[PDB]
Coordinates of C-alpha atoms in Angstrom, one line a residue:
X6 CA -4.7 -20.3 -10.8
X7 CA -6.6 -17.0 -11.4
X8 CA -3.5 -15.0 -10.5
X9 CA -1.0 -15.6 -13.3
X10 CA 2.8 -15.3 -13.1
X11 CA 2.4 -11.8 -14.7
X12 CA -0.5 -9.5 -13.8
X13 CA -1.6 -5.9 -14.4
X14 CA -3.7 -3.6 -12.2
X15 CA -5.5 -0.3 -12.4
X16 CA -6.0 1.9 -9.3
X17 CA -8.1 5.0 -8.4
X18 CA -7.6 6.9 -5.2
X19 CA -10.0 9.6 -3.8
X20 CA -8.4 11.4 -0.8
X21 CA -8.0 14.4 1.5
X22 CA -5.0 15.5 3.5
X23 CA -5.6 18.3 6.1
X24 CA -8.8 19.1 4.1
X25 CA -7.0 19.3 0.7
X26 CA -9.0 17.1 -1.7
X27 CA -7.3 15.2 -4.6
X28 CA -7.6 12.2 -6.9
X29 CA -5.0 9.7 -8.3
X30 CA -5.3 7.3 -11.2
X31 CA -2.7 4.7 -12.2
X32 CA -1.7 1.4 -13.7
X33 CA 0.8 -1.2 -12.5
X34 CA 2.1 -4.7 -13.2
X35 CA 4.2 -7.3 -11.5
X36 CA 5.2 -11.0 -11.0
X37 CA 2.9 -12.0 -8.1
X38 CA 4.8 -15.2 -7.2
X39 CA 8.2 -13.4 -7.3
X40 CA 6.9 -10.6 -5.0
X41 CA 7.8 -7.7 -7.4
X42 CA 5.6 -4.9 -8.9
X43 CA 5.7 -1.4 -10.3
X44 CA 3.0 1.3 -10.7
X45 CA 2.8 4.6 -12.5
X46 CA 0.4 7.1 -10.8
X47 CA -0.9 10.5 -12.0
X48 CA -2.6 13.2 -9.9
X49 CA -5.9 13.7 -11.8
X50 CA -7.5 16.3 -9.3
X51 CA -6.1 18.7 -6.7
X52 CA -2.5 18.7 -8.0
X53 CA 0.2 19.7 -7.3
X54 CA -0.2 18.0 -3.9
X55 CA 0.9 20.2 -0.9
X56 CA 2.1 17.1 1.0
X57 CA 4.6 14.2 0.8
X58 CA 3.8 11.6 -1.8
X59 CA 5.2 9.0 0.7
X60 CA 1.9 9.2 2.7
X61 CA 0.1 7.8 -0.4
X62 CA 2.7 5.3 -1.7
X63 CA 1.7 2.3 0.6
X64 CA -2.0 2.7 -0.4
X65 CA -1.3 1.7 -4.1
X67 CA -1.3 -4.3 -3.9
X68 CA -1.6 -7.5 -1.8
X69 CA -1.7 -10.1 -4.6
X70 CA 2.0 -9.5 -5.3
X71 CA 3.7 -11.0 -2.2
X72 CA 6.0 -14.1 -2.7
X73 CA 4.8 -16.8 -0.2
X74 CA 6.7 -20.0 0.7
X75 CA 4.7 -23.1 -0.2
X76 CA 3.9 -23.8 3.5
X77 CA 2.3 -20.3 4.1
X78 CA -1.2 -20.2 2.5
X79 CA -1.6 -16.9 0.4
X80 CA -4.6 -15.2 2.0
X81 CA -4.9 -12.7 -0.9
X82 CA -4.1 -15.0 -4.0
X83 CA -6.8 -17.5 -2.7
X84 CA -9.5 -14.8 -2.5
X85 CA -9.7 -14.5 -6.4
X86 CA -11.6 -14.0 -8.6
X87 CA -13.8 -12.2 -6.0
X88 CA -10.9 -10.5 -4.2
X89 CA -10.6 -8.7 -0.8
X90 CA -10.9 -5.4 1.0
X91 CA -8.5 -3.8 3.4
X92 CA -8.7 -0.9 5.9
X93 CA -5.9 0.8 7.6
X94 CA -5.0 3.4 10.2
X95 CA -1.6 5.2 10.2
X96 CA -0.6 7.1 13.4
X97 CA 2.5 9.3 13.1
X98 CA 4.8 10.4 16.0
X99 CA 3.6 14.1 15.7
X100 CA -0.1 13.3 15.8
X101 CA -0.7 13.0 12.0
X102 CA -3.4 10.4 11.4
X103 CA -4.5 8.6 8.1
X104 CA -7.5 6.3 7.6
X105 CA -7.6 4.2 4.4
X106 CA -10.2 1.9 2.8
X107 CA -9.5 -0.3 -0.2
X108 CA -11.3 -2.7 -2.5
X109 CA -9.5 -5.2 -4.8
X110 CA -11.4 -7.0 -7.5
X111 CA -10.6 -8.7 -10.8
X112 CA -12.3 -7.5 -14.1
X113 CA -11.4 -8.2 -17.7
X114 CA -8.2 -10.1 -16.7
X115 CA -7.0 -7.0 -14.7
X116 CA -6.8 -6.3 -11.0
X117 CA -8.9 -3.3 -10.0
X118 CA -8.0 -1.2 -6.9
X119 CA -10.3 1.5 -5.4
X120 CA -8.9 3.6 -2.5
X121 CA -10.3 6.2 -0.2
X122 CA -8.0 8.1 2.1
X123 CA -8.4 10.8 4.8
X124 CA -5.4 12.3 6.6
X125 CA -5.8 14.9 9.4
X126 CA -3.8 16.5 12.2
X127 CA -0.5 16.8 10.2
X128 CA 1.4 19.8 11.7
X129 CA 1.3 22.5 8.9
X130 CA 5.1 23.1 9.4
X131 CA 5.9 19.3 9.9
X132 CA 7.7 17.1 7.3
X133 CA 4.6 15.7 5.6
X134 CA 2.9 19.1 4.8
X135 CA 6.4 20.6 4.0
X136 CA 7.4 17.7 1.7
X137 CA 10.6 17.0 3.8
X138 CA 10.4 13.1 3.5
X139 CA 12.3 10.9 1.1
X140 CA 10.9 7.4 1.3
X141 CA 10.1 4.5 3.6
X142 CA 12.7 2.3 5.1
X143 CA 12.5 -1.5 4.6
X144 CA 9.7 -2.8 6.8
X145 CA 8.4 -6.0 8.4
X146 CA 4.6 -6.4 8.6
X147 CA 3.6 -8.8 11.5
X148 CA 0.4 -10.6 10.5
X149 CA -1.9 -13.0 12.2
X150 CA -5.3 -14.5 11.5
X151 CA -8.4 -13.5 13.5
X152 CA -11.5 -15.6 12.6
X153 CA -11.8 -15.1 8.7
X154 CA -9.7 -11.8 8.5
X155 CA -5.9 -11.2 8.5
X156 CA -4.5 -8.4 10.8
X157 CA -1.1 -6.8 10.3
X158 CA 0.9 -4.2 12.2
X159 CA 4.0 -2.4 11.0
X160 CA 6.6 -0.1 12.6
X161 CA 7.2 2.3 9.6
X162 CA 9.9 4.9 9.3
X163 CA 10.1 7.8 6.7
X164 CA 13.5 9.1 5.9
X165 CA 13.7 12.9 6.4
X166 CA 15.5 14.9 3.7
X167 CA 17.6 17.0 6.2
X168 CA 18.4 13.9 8.4
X169 CA 16.7 11.4 10.8
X170 CA 13.6 9.4 10.8
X171 CA 9.8 10.1 11.2
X172 CA 7.9 7.1 12.6
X173 CA 4.4 5.8 12.1
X174 CA 2.4 2.7 13.4
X175 CA 0.4 1.0 10.6
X176 CA -2.6 -1.2 11.5
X177 CA -4.4 -3.0 8.7
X178 CA -7.2 -5.6 8.5
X179 CA -7.4 -7.6 5.2
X180 CA -10.9 -9.1 4.5
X181 CA -11.3 -11.8 1.8
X182 CA -14.6 -11.8 0.0
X183 CA -14.9 -15.6 0.4
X184 CA -13.6 -18.2 2.8
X185 CA -9.9 -19.1 2.2
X186 CA -7.4 -21.4 4.0
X187 CA -6.0 -19.2 6.8
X188 CA -2.2 -18.9 7.3
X189 CA -0.8 -19.0 10.8
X190 CA 1.1 -15.9 12.2
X191 CA 3.8 -14.7 9.7
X192 CA 5.8 -11.7 8.6
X193 CA 6.2 -9.9 5.3
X194 CA 9.5 -8.2 4.6
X195 CA 9.1 -5.4 2.1
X196 CA 10.7 -2.4 0.5
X197 CA 8.8 0.3 -1.4
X198 CA 10.8 2.8 -3.6
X199 CA 9.8 5.9 -5.6
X200 CA 11.8 5.0 -8.8
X201 CA 10.8 8.1 -10.9
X202 CA 8.9 11.3 -10.4
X203 CA 8.4 14.6 -12.1
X204 CA 9.3 17.8 -10.2
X205 CA 5.9 18.4 -8.5
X206 CA 5.1 14.6 -8.0
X207 CA 2.0 14.8 -10.3
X208 CA 3.5 11.7 -12.1
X209 CA 5.2 9.1 -10.0
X210 CA 6.5 5.5 -10.5
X211 CA 7.0 3.2 -7.6
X212 CA 8.3 -0.4 -7.1
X213 CA 7.7 -2.8 -4.2
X214 CA 9.3 -6.2 -3.4
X215 CA 7.8 -8.3 -0.6
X216 CA 8.3 -11.8 0.7
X217 CA 6.4 -13.7 3.4
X218 CA 8.3 -15.8 6.0
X219 CA 7.6 -17.4 9.4
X220 CA 7.8 -15.4 12.7

C-alpha cells in the first residue's frame, strides 16, 4: 500500500480565535496500522496565543487510525490523492469553531493544510483564559453518506480548577476518489499534550485511535 507501516507528515494551520490571527507549522510521524502518532507544532505567527491550545489540538490526522480487517479504511484507501475534511465545533457557552483541512501525499510525506476560525468565546471563559487541560477520551460515531463519511463526537475539555467543558464536534470527511465505503462504526481515541513550553509556542501531542463496530 501507499500508506506504509511508518509515515511522516507536515502540517500548516492558518487561524483566528475571537479575531486574533495566528499560524502554526509542524511535523509528525506515526504507525498508521497501529493507530499511534505524535506531532511537534510551533507557533510561527501571532504567538504567544491568548487562548487554550486544546482548541487547536484536534485539527492536527486521519490516516493513522487502526482499523479491523472487516472495516474498510476510508482514509487509507484515498491515497495517493488523499481527502479533505470540514468540521464545526459548538461549545456549551456559545464558542464556535469552523475548520477546513486538506490532506495530500508529496515526496513520500503526508501534507496537511488547515484553516480555522473560532468566534463567540466568552472573553472570561476557560478557552480565552487558558483554563483547560486536555480532552477526555472520546468516541467518534461515523457513518457513510453517498461518497462521504460523517462523524459526530461528544467532546469534553478538563478544566484546570475542576469539572468539564463540553463541545459537540461534527465533521465530514471527503475522499478525493471513490473508495470502498465502511458501514457505520466508531473510533475510540485519546489525544494528549505530551510536552509544551511555558507559553505553548512549542507543543508535542500524541494520539491513539482504534475503529470498531457500533
